[PDB]
Symmetry: C2
Subunit: 349 residues, 2 copies
């Protein structure tokens, strides 16, 4: 007798090969495929291997929904002999069809991975319309956004918006927009495209005429940064790989808290009151969950966990410094905020 | 070579017995102990057993923090021979010291369980003080709250608040409060105790003089309900066991959405505009995570997942009905809301 929500009976999804993979690829819309070797390793390896097989076939067998061809690229074989098929190394959860195909070197767990399954099989992006969707336009205070007024469901600019969103599954936001109501409320003069800031919700319009792939992918990949960065599931290490510095400049303040709302909105008060402030963008860990990595940061970001924290980590070997003189659990913020941001305070340590 | 955050080297926390358990109990502050049998079962059982050992010793070994004596009550033995020691059956994650000892028949996963570890080792409850903690008083729009103005850190009423909060680890909220600032803002005439609604944030003062254990445990356990109920990790099945009906009256509307904010605040508009409305309290599933059980509700609550849903489940065998005629993905809410709440609309189906 198993448990809940443990797998349904037997591990049935597929570790496979070429012909199957091609028939089923051209049949399917989502293909979650990890490439792996013929694994037979040491003691400490087959444990994470077994947990990998288990989160895999648990999410799979517990799903059996219309979306995924699932599990493994068996080894080296025909991919290698074509070139490597233009792939990565001995491991990656490459997901097919998405854009054409995309990677997965994100983090491994249930809630996150099924979240990925659904919100990625979106097919395509965010259709907004009603007055309550006018509210949806002035709703998201969390992410960086990209709205656009368009002409049809089967439209040229609509298509560009779709395949550019699937090129940017990364994350951020993609509002497909219609009608004179939100047209008059938003006010961008024509059926165009408009970017938007996380908090300090600004319509940063994309400002020419018609716009295409590398142009709006230009606005997105060029200006994905702004002021504070909300860190999430895989988004911490993935914004590490998305161009860092070496100094992990973090604001560590969990939500459901005074320190969360106050830290968040005093740095974001520096954003929304000092619109510019280009001291390079500060990041935001705010531990509600992800406590394993919050334990990793409890020992490696010295000894800190449930406090109003803020500081930097010099990646490896040396140090991981934070807030010190001042501190106070009920922090001095305000102009002290203006300082200790505006260069850890202008003057160094 | 293991992975991240996979366990540190070897599974070292303890499946033990009496003398050890007593020395270490009287030494420790948190004891996370599951009682189990000498397990040697069939094929489908030892899988969830292995995943149980693995989430267990993963959170443990990856923690090694100052809090827990950890893992297993080996079998029947001295507990049984004393009586059963006044325990449950062959299984429960009984956690010692907490109140004196408390259960755990909640859900099993990392983020949730470490969240439990920290927020339960709180030791004691929520000390609020500053003007930013005046903001903390008018901050939580999510939970049901219990503030109280007190006299000292080592105070009588303070103690009652502590051990009553640990009696109610259940959940809700517990604000220990001081000083004339939030005293004048809150205005309850003396150093007393005050309850508070989730949304429609109301100071429902606890209205006599001094108050004790079974009196404020009376206000809490008697009036923990109000209007809409935010469902969470274990809180769905645990508010099933916390007195249900049979009809699982749910509002199914995920956040990051028009349907989330609109459903949430139109039923909560019925709360905040119709202060009373005692049609018995409606619940609130809003799937950001917990997608396994959202899959369980995708097949068992008929066929629904990422929509503006709302309806009931007649527990077992028969049916699980929801919103039908009207529906619309951009819902008719307003007076239609007033109906389809105020008895699935007054008139039955």
């Amino acid at each position: 007798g198993l448990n809940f929500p443990t797998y349904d009976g037997k591990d049935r999804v597929v570790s496979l090969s070429e012909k199957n993979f091609k028939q089923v690829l051209k049949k399917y819309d989502l293909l979650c495929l990890y490439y792996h070797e013929p694994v037979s390793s040491d003691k400490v390896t087959q444990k994470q291997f077994q947990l990998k097989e288990i989160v895999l076939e648990l999410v799979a067998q517990v799903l059996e929904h219309k979306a995924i061809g699932f599990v493994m690229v068996d080894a080296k074989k025909e991919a290698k002999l074509a070139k490597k098929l233009g792939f990565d190394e001995e491991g990656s959860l490459y997901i097919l069809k998405g854009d054409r195909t995309i990677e997965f070197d994100g983090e491994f767990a249930a809630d996150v991975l099924v979240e990925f399954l659904l919100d990625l099989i979106e097919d395509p992006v965010e259709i907004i319309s009603s007055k309550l969707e006018v509210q949806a336009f002035e709703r998201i205070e969390d992410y960086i956004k990209l709205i656009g007024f368009f002409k049809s469901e089967d439209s040229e600019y609509y298509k560009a918006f779709e395949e550019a969103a699937e090129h940017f599954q990364p994350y951020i936001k993609f509002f497909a927009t219609f009608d004179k109501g939100v047209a008059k409320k938003l006010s961008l003069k024509m059926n165009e495209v408009d970017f938007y800031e996380p908090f300090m919700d600004e319509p940063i319009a994309i400002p020419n005429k018609p716009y295409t792939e590398e142009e709006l992918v230009e606005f997105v990949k060029e200006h994905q940064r702004p002021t504070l960065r909300r860190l999430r599931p895989e988004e911490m290490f993935e914004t590490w790989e998305d161009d860092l510095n070496g100094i992990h400049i973090v604001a560590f303040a969990e939500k459901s808290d005074p320190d969360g709302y106050e830290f968040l909105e005093i740095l974001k008060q520096v954003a929304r009151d000092n619109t510019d402030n280009p001291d390079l963008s500060i990041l935001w860990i705010d531990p509600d969950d992800f406590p394993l990595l919050v334990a990793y940061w409890e020992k490696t970001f010295k000894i800190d966990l449930f406090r109003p924290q803020i500081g930097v980590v010099n990646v490896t070997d040396a140090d991981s410094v934070w807030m010190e003189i001042p501190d106070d659990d009920d922090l001095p913020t305000a102009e002290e905020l203006e300082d200790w941001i505006e260069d850890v305070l202008s003057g160094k340590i």
